[PDB]
Amino acid sequence: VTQTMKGLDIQKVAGTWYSLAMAASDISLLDAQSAPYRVYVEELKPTPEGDLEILFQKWENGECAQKKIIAEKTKIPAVFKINKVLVLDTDYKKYLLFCMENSAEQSLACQCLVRTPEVDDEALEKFDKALKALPMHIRLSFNPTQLEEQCHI
Amino acid sequence: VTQTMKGLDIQKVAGTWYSLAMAASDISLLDAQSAPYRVYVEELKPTPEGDLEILFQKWENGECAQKKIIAEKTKIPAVFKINKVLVLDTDYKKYLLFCMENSAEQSLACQCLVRTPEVDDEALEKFDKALKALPMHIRLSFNPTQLEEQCHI
Ligand SMILES: CCCCOc1ccc(OCCCN2CCOCC2)cc1
Ligand SMILES: CCCCOc1ccc(OCCCN2CCOCC2)cc1
Numbered sequence: 167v168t169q170t171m172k173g174l175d176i177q178k179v180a181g182t183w184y185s186l187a188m189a190a191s192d193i194s195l196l197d198a199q200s201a202p203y204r205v206y207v208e209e210l211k212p213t214p215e216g217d218l219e220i221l222f223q224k225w226e227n228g229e230c231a232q233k234k235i236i237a238e239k240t241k242i243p244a245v246f247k248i249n250k251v252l253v254l255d256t257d258y259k260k261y262l263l264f265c266m267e268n269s270a271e272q273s274l275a276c277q278c279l280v281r282t283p284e285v286d287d288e289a290l291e292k293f294d295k296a297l298k299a300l301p302m303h304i305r306l307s308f309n310p311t312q313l314e315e316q317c318h319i
Numbered sequence: 320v321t322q323t324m325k326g327l328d329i330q331k332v333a334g335t336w337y338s339l340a341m342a343a344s345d346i347s348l349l350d351a352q353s354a355p356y357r358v359y360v361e362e363l364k365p366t367p368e369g370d371l372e373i374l375f376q377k378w379e380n381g382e383c384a385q386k387k388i389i390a391e392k393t394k395i396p397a398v399f400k401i402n403k404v405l406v407l408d409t410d411y412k413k414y415l416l417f418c419m420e421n422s423a424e425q426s427l428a429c430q431c432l433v434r435t436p437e438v439d440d441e442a443l444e445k446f447d448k449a450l451k452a453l454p455m456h457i458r459l460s461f462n463p464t465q466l467e468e469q470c471h472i
Contacts, residue, residue, distance in 0.1 A: 197350050305458040306346055
């Protein structure tokens with residue numbers, strides 16, 4: 167992935183997000199409710215020291231679990247460590263595009279986050295333009311009804 | 320779906336095809352190996368009377384089953400009945416885009432078929448342009464290795 171947000175202000179991504187669309191390099195990363203990168207973002211809580219705490223949902227044992235993780239800051243403002251989290255682009259008000267990647271061929275998953283339970287075509291376009299550069303083999307998108315549901319059921 | 324192939328010559332789609340990409344209106348139509356519209360085209364055998372016999376693979380009971388169905392012709396050369404099959408576009412030599420649709424909100428699945436076990440970017444573009452008009456919520460694509468495998472494993 168060689169798109170990062172120039173001049174990311176991590177404090178300003180704080181609060182409510184909706185995982186509107188997801189994509190991944192391998193179908194097995196997103197295909198089942200329990201697929202490893204099938205993670206539904208709920209809220210981003212950046213620390214004063216500039217780390218990013220993430221609240222998300224995960225279908226684990228036939229159940230929508232609430233989960234909590236801290237992404238540790240790096241020397242690059244748009245890159246955090248868990249396995250790396252890269253912030254591609256955000257207007258802070260509406261949408262945020264991010265990817266997660268490991269080290270191996272690498273696993274890669276990217277989401278289009280939006281602030282509201284609405285299909286934002288403009289954001290989905292930017293998400294698709296960003297993905298053109300990337301070797302994705304599965305893409306998912308969610309309707310407004312599903313965005314208001316635990317684990318988007 | 321309001322894109323059909325003008326002047327389709329069904330005889331000329333005869334032979335070997337590869338399901339390179341699939342998309343559907345609902346994630347549950349494609350998400351699992353056993354999802355109902357997760358069908359891998361192998362060969363099209365059009366009848367003299369102008370019907371279309373389809374050989375495909377389907378993961379059913381933990382197994383890649385070989386399956387056989389006849390799509391019956393209609394008054395529209397680009398539309399067959401099984402549940403309707405619509406042929407969107409084909410250059411006969413390289414690619415064929417088709418959709419399958421039921422009657423209800425309708426289930427809708429579309430594929431980009433190619434003649435060879437190769438990622439055809441030009442065909443994938445035409446597939447994506449055709450899908451822009453359609454309410455798809457899952458997209459899959461397969462690599463050359465998977466195209467040579469039963470049920471694309
Ligand atoms: C600003 C970008 C937001 C990043 O959001 C996330 C980044 C990584 C995530 O990783 C989830 C970790 C995968 N496992 C899921 C099952 O529980 C253990 C962790 C989740 C959200
Ligand atoms: C030229 C267009 C090719 C159309 O190819 C197909 C059209 C419909 C298909 O329908 C599959 C029927 C769904 N079930 C799968 C499990 O066995 C029963 C049938 C398969 C290929």
